[PDB]
Write a protein that binds this ligand. Structure first.
Ligand code: ZN
Length: 35
């Protein structure tokens, strides 16, 4: 797993340290592959 993900619900990127997006606090689903 890369360990990094971007939030497309509000165009905001989050780093591995993040947990819940600041603008909308995304659940941060755990997915091995983004695609
Ligand atoms: Zn977001």
């Amino acid at each position: 797993a890369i360990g990094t993900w971007d939030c497309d619900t509000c165009l905001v990127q989050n780093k591995p340290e993040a947990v819940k997006c600041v603008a909308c606090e995304t659940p941060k689903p755990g997915t091995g592959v983004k695609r």
